[PDB]
Amino acid sequence: IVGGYTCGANTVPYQVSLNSGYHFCGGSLINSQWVVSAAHCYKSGIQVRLGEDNINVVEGNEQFISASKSIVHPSYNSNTLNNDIMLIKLKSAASLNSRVASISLPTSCASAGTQCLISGWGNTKSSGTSYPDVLKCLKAPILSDSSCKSAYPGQITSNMFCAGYLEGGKDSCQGDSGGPVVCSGKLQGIVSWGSGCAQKNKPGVYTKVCNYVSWIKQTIASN
Numbered sequence: 001i002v003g004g005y006t007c008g009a010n011t012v013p014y015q016v017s018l019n020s021g022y023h024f025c026g027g028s029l030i031n032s033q034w035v036v037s038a039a040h041c042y043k044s045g046i047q048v049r050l051g052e053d054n055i056n057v058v059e060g061n062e063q064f065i066s067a068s069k070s071i072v073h074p075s076y077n078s079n080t081l082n083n084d085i086m087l088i089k090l091k092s093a094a095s096l097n098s099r100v101a102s103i104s105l106p107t108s109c110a111s112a113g114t115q116c117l118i119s120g121w122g123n124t125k126s127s128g129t130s131y132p133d134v135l136k137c138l139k140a141p142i143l144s145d146s147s148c149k150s151a152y153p154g155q156i157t158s159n160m161f162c163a164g165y166l167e168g169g170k171d172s173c174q175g176d177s178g179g180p181v182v183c184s185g186k187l188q189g190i191v192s193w194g195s196g197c198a199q200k201n202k203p204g205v206y207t208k209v210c211n212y213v214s215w216i217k218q219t220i221a222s223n
């Protein structure tokens with residue numbers, strides 16, 4: 001997260017860290033057994049880390065649980081990042097408490113101008129690199145589809161939306177991948193892609209979760 005602020009420990013209790021020896025992606029807890037993240041985060045050897053603030057220090061509220069199954073969206077296209085969503089089932093159910101809590105799925109899509117909270121442990125610099133160890137947060141509005149498509153001609157699909165600031169300075173970034181965009185209590189987006197980070201006229205692009213709620217619900221019910 002570039003241009004954000006330190007969230008505060010466990011203030012984003014649905015935020016998970018995906019760990020394969022090291023943090024590599026965010027995700028969002030959607031019930032005690034399931035996390036949703038980005039398909040571009042797919043790999044083997046995933047341990048889900050819940051209740052994290054400092055990902056380098058055991059602070060006392062963590063739960064570490066291995067993935068038992070990962071399901072990349074059936075239509076994910078890695079060339080275009082279309083359908084960039086993946087479900088991860090946990091080997092055992094997380095114990096839900098104030099610091100480890102699910103986030104609701106959309107009941108409908110969200111409109112341009114709606115304000116959202118984006119969070120993660122990704123890069124905090126727009127040029128060069130600096131990775132924080134505590135969770136960072138950013139408030140950002142959803143941008144119009146037309147400004148999104150104008151910023152990224154030939155690359156925005158119906159399963160994507162832009163959020164952030166066209167002026168630059170405030171954005172998600174590498175390492176925030178797969179993490180949440182929460183707007184009025186609903187998980188509307190997943191950190192997906194963009195050109196650089198926090199650059200002028202290059203806002204963040206996010207998976208449009210409202211398009212996937214039926215798939216998520218049916219997949220969880222059958223698995």
Ligand SMILES: C[C@H](NC(=O)[C@H](N)CCc1ccc(O)cc1)C(=O)NCc1ccc(C(=N)N)cc1
Nearest residue numbers: 079080081155172173174192193194196197204
């Ligand atoms: C795997 C993904 N790749 C890209 O983003 C490429 N530059 C375009 C892919 C690509 C997409 C569509 C296409 O049609 C072709 C290639 C990535 O690195 N995500 C982390 C990220 C990146 C940016 C931001 C941000 N600035 N908000 C946040 C997290």
Ligand SMILES: [Ca+2]
Nearest residue numbers: 054057058059
């Ligand atoms: Ca920790």
